[PDB]
Amino acid sequence: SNAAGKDYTVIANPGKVEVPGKIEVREFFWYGCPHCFKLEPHMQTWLKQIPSDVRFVRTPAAMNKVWEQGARTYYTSEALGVRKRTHLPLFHAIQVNGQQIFDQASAAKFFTRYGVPEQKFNSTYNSFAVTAKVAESNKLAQQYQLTGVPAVVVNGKYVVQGEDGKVTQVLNYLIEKERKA
Amino acid sequence: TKPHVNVGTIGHVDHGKTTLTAAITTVLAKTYGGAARAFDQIDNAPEEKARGITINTSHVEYDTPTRHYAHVDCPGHADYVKNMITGAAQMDGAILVVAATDGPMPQTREHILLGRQVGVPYIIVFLNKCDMVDDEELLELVEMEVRELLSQYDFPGDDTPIVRGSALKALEGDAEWEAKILELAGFLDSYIPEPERAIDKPFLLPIEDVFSISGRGTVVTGRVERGIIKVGEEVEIVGIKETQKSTCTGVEMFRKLLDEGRAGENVGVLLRGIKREEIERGQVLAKPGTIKPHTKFESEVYILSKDEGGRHTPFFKGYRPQFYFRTTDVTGTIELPEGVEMVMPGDNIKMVVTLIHPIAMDDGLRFAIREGGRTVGAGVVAKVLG
Numbered sequence: 329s330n331a332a333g334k335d336y337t338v339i340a341n342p343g344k345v346e347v348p349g350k351i352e353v354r355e356f357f358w359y360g361c362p363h364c365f366k367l368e369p370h371m372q373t374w375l376k377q378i379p380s381d382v383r384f385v386r387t388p389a390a391m392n393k394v395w396e397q398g399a400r401t402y403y404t405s406e407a408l409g410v411r412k413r414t415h416l417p418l419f420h421a422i423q424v425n426g427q428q429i430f431d432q433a434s435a436a437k438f439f440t441r442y443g444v445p446e447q448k449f450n451s452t453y454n455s456f457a458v459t460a461k462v463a464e465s466n467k468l469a470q471q472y473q474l475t476g477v478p479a480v481v482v483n484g485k486y487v488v489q490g491e492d493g494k495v496t497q498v499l500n501y502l503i504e505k506e507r508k509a
Numbered sequence: 510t511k512p513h514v515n516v517g518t519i520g521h522v523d524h525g526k527t528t529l530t531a532a533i534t535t536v537l538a539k540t541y542g543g544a545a546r547a548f549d550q551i552d553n554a555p556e557e558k559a560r561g562i563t564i565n566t567s568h569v570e571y572d573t574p575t576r577h578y579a580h581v582d583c584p585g586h587a588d589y590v591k592n593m594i595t596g597a598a599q600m601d602g603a604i605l606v607v608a609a610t611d612g613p614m615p616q617t618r619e620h621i622l623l624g625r626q627v628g629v630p631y632i633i634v635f636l637n638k639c640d641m642v643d644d645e646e647l648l649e650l651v652e653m654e655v656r657e658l659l660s661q662y663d664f665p666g667d668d669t670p671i672v673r674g675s676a677l678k679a680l681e682g683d684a685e686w687e688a689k690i691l692e693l694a695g696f697l698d699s700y701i702p703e704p705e706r707a708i709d710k711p712f713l714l715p716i717e718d719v720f721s722i723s724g725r726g727t728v729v730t731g732r733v734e735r736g737i738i739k740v741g742e743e744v745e746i747v748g749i750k751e752t753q754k755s756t757c758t759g760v761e762m763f764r765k766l767l768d769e770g771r772a773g774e775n776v777g778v779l780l781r782g783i784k785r786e787e788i789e790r791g792q793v794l795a796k797p798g799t800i801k802p803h804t805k806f807e808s809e810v811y812i813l814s815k816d817e818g819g820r821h822t823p824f825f826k827g828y829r830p831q832f833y834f835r836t837t838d839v840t841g842t843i844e845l846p847e848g849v850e851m852v853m854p855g856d857n858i859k860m861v862v863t864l865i866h867p868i869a870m871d872d873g874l875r876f877a878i879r880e881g882g883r884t885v886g887a888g889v890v891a892k893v894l895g
C-alpha cells in the first residue's frame with residue numbers, strides 16, 4: 329500500500345532540495361539506533377541500483393547532544409573522504425559488537441584503524457564546516473517536523489518511516505510519482 | 510600479540526609490484542594460514558568528492574608465524590610520491606621490486622631517493638621476472654647495479670637482502686617459485702627490526718594549551734605523543750623561545766592529579782618555576798637532551814593540485830607560507846632547487862626552509878603547508894640544518 333497519510337506523510341512545510349535536477353532521497357539516522365540499523369541492509373540493497381535521476385544523502389540526526397556526536401562523526405568521515413569504508417563497520421561495531429563509540433575520543437580511536445590521525449579527526453570534528461552540517465541537519469529536521477529516527481524524506485515533501493523493505497518499496501513508489509511533473 | 514610491521518612495495522611501473530603483493534598474501538596464506546579478517550563491508554551509498562589529497566592505495570595484510578604485516582601498494586608513480594611523503598602509514602620497511610628483464614629504471618632510482626628523503630629505514634629487494642631469464646651472469650649484473658644504486662642514497666647496498674623470484678609463477682602456484690616468496694617473507698621477519706613502541710621512546714608532549722593554576726603556577730595540556738612523564742622528572746620546553754628546563758610536579762587528568770602520564774593520554778602537566786607568559790602553544794615538553802630546536806631544514810614537499818583543493822596558481826622563490834608543525838603555524842621562507850623558478854600545483858620538490866622562529870624537530874617529522882588554515886601542501890623534514 330502507498331496511501332498518503334497512512335504509508336507515508338506529506339510534509340506541511342515542504343523544502344527545496346539541495347541539488348536541483350535530481351529527486352532527493354534523504355535519510356535521517358543515528359549510529360546508536362537499532363531501528364536505523366535494521367533499516368540499513370534494506371537501504372544498502374536499494375542503493376545498489378540507484379536511478380540516474382535521484383540523489384541519495386544521509387543526514388544524521390543532531391537535535392540533541394547525544395545524537396550530535398554520531399552526527400559529527402559521520403560528517404567527519406565524509407569530510408576526510410573515508411565514509412565509504414567506515415560507515416558500515418562503525419555501525420557494526422556499535423550495534424553488533426558492544427563498542428562504546430559515542431563521543432569524540434572513542435570515535436577518534438576508532439578512526440585510527442583507517443589511517444586517520446587523531447589530530448586530524450579532532451580538528452575536523454569541531455570545524456566550522458562540520459558544525460554547519462549539524463546546523464543544516466537540525467534546520468531540516470525542524471522544518472520537516474521529524475520527532476525521531478529512522479526517517480526517509482523524498483524530494484523534501486514526503487516522509488517515510490519504518491525499518492524494513494516496506495520502506496524501500498514506498499520510496500520507489502514516491503520516486504516514480506515525482507517523475508511525473 | 511604478534512608485532513605489527515608496516516611495509517609496502519616500491520619500484521618502476523610494470524616491474525611486478527601488484528603481482529608480488531598478491532603473491533605474498535596467497536603463498537603466506539596457504540603456508541601459515543591467512544591473516545585475521547575484520548568486518549569491512551563497503552557502503553553502496555554514493556560519496557561526493559571532498560577536499561584533500563587524493564591517494565590511490567591498495568592494502569593487504571598477511572602473517573608469518575611471528576609477525577603481522579600491513580602492506581600498502583599503489584597503482585602509479587604519482588601515488589607512490591604522495592603516499593611516501595604524506596601517506597596514511599609510515600613504512601617500517603619497503604620491498605623494492607626490480608624486473609630482471611629491465612634492470613633498475615628511472616622510478617627505481619626515484620623511489621630509492623624518496624625513500625632516503627622521507628626516512629624509509631629499510632629496503633629489501635625482490636628481483637622479479639627471473640622466470641624469463643636463463644642467465645645467472647645477467648642476474649648477478651642486475652643485482653650489482655641495484656646494490657650500487659642503494660648505496661648511492663646511503664642504504665647499505667652490500668648488506669641488502671635480494672631475493673631472485675617470479676611473482677607471477679608463484680601466484681600461479683608453481684612450488685619452486687613459491688619458495689622464493691617464503692624466502693622474501695623470511696627476510697621481512699629477520700631484516701626489519703621490530704619497530705620501537707611509542708611508550709618506550711623518550712617522553713614527548715606537543716603543547717596544545719597553557720593555563721594558570723594554583724594562583725601562580727602553570728599547567729600545559731596536550732596528548733603524550735611518546736614515552737612516560739612522571740612527577741619529579743625534569744623536562745625541557747623546546748622550540749619558539751629559548752629552551753627552558755622545568756620539573757613536573759603533577760599530571761592532571763580530569764579532576765585529579767596523577768603521578769604519571771603515558772603515551773596516548775590527554776593530560777595537563779604542572780610545571781615548577783614557569784610563568785604563564787614563559788610558555789606557549791606549539792612548544793614541546795621533552796626528556797632533556799632528546800630534541801633540539803631548528804629554524805632551517807631540507808624537506809621533500811608535495812603541493813596539492815587545484816582538484817585536491819590546493820592553490821590555483823604557481824608560487825615563486827619569494828613565497829612565504831604557514832608551516833604547520835604538530836600544534837601550531839610558523840611562517841617561513843623557501844629556497845627552490847637551482848634551475849627551478851616556480852612550483853606548480855601538483856608538483857613535488859625538495860625545498861629548503863627557514864622558519865621565523867625555531868621549532869622542535871628531527872629528521873622525518875611531517876608537516877603541512879597552509880594558507881589561512883587551508884592545507885595547500887604536505888612535507889617531511891629530510892635533513893635538519895640549523
Ligand SMILES: Nc1nc2c(ncn2[C@@H]2O[C@H](COP(=O)(O)OP(=O)(O)O)[C@@H](O)[C@H]2O)c(=O)[nH]1
Pocket residue numbers: 521522523524525526527528529584637638639640641674675676677678
Ligand atoms: N613473466 C612474468 N611476468 C610478470 C611477473 N610479475 C609480473 N608480471 C607481469 O608483468 C606485468 C606488470 O605486472 P604488475 O604487478 O601489474 O606491475 P606493477 O605496475 O609493478 O604493479 C603484468 O602483466 C604481470 O602479469 C613475473 O614474475 N614473470
Ligand SMILES: [Mg+2]
Pocket residue numbers: 526527528583584
Ligand atoms: Mg601495480
